[model samples]
Target: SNAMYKEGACLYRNPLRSKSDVKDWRMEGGGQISFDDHSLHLSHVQDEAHFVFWCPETFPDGIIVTWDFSPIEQPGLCMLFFAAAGIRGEDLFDPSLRKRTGTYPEYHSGDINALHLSYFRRKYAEERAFRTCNLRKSRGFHLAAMGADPLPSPDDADSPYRMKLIKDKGYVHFSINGLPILEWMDDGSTYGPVLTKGKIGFRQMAPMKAVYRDFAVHQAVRR
Candidate 1:
């Protein structure tokens, strides 16, 4: 069964144009969206991010939010990276926001999702070294210490992602639709040197049709 997840719905805002602005970002010939008083709907083919926000330093316990999509596509060629906030065309290749470098499970040759979380740091350049993690590999996500490795094609599964400050005692858990899929502990010496300790988000390259809905965050309470 598909598990329904709802967390930070109120915190759900458009990090694109405005903080409270939430809408569809579709390419030419892409799908469309319609909304009613209760919820929003994507009518044929359209990409979406229901909840988008960065982990700010104001949160003491640190944010542990999570959300899952319905696995929209399995394109053979598609690059999926997570952005800290929005997609800024200029800084896509910046070394500091290297937290995005991995392959998503998709099928087409040129259908890559080049979206990067580096946009989030652009607004606040002071927080550019934030962390990012992914679950495409052996379950326990990758901790991009000072951002991730160089970006790779969606075809490369072993592409690396790094992050900072992984708890030695706590385990890095992976899941799909809120289902436990993988877990591991950092031992404090895994990914590498520590970087920033802030916000995180995901990205799916184009030619691949995927939707990010029911996205939420929660605190990591146990191992």
Candidate 2:
């Protein structure tokens, strides 16, 4: 049964507690988790420390994902992997599928299919030179869209920014603080079919320390 989510009533709400709270979460790579003021802090200890933190819930096609983020440390990048599933329509946790260990190639070129959006990019010299958000579809790394990133540098951001992603039918929209930043329509024929019913994950590049909180997923209230 589909239901609308009240302001504070979410189908899924992760206050991002301490490590113990993430026992059900799948951690790939070397991500370290800590908590303060109800917010979760994520960072990597090893060199080139990148990782993916996968939520256990599987969301339907039409949903709204919202969260708050603050850049604690920079010169890195952050991405959201959504509509993720086994390429052949297997459950992400299906044992028969190839294992994923938080590596880049595994999610992009490996046996999985997903739509990933790189929102805060500052890792490469070129990216740092000109900041922008990117959206790509996987099974094959196809650059589907791009948009201007409105986030400031870590040192400059004084408060957490509200971010939201709305995926309805074949359309996707991303916004920051209620301001539309990017929008795209998936024409099933161009880059595979319209993705539906899959898991979502948070990814971060090495050397990036960020605090995230107020994660909630709601069924999209489409008109």
Q: Best candidate per lDDT, number?
A: 2
Q: For residues 1-223, what per-residue lDDT tens digits would candidate 1 score against the true structure?
A: 1122223223333323222334333222233333432222222342332222222321212234443222233331122233222123223223443232232222111222121222112112233243222322111234322223232333443312222211112233334323343344434355422221223433333223333334433443332
CA error at residue 218 for candidate 2, angstroms: 0.4
Clashing pairs in 2: none
Q: After superposition, how far is residue 155 of candidate 1 from its true place, in Å?
A: 21
TM-score of each: 0.38, 0.93
Query: Which segments of candidate 1 are over 4 A away from where they belong?
Result: 1-62, 76-170, 194-196
Residue-wise C-alpha lDDT for candidate 2, range 1-223, written one tens digit per residue: 1223223326787767566667798988998888877678999987597999999888888888999989888778999999999998888888988888788999999998999999779888999888889999998998988888989888789768999988766788888887777878899999989888799999999888999987888877765
Model 2 segments more than 4 A misplaced: 1-9
- Candidate 2's C-alpha lDDT? 0.85
- Residue range with the least summed lDDT across 10 consecutive positions in model 1: 107-116
Q: Which ten residues in a row have the lowest lDDT in candidate 2?
A: 1-10
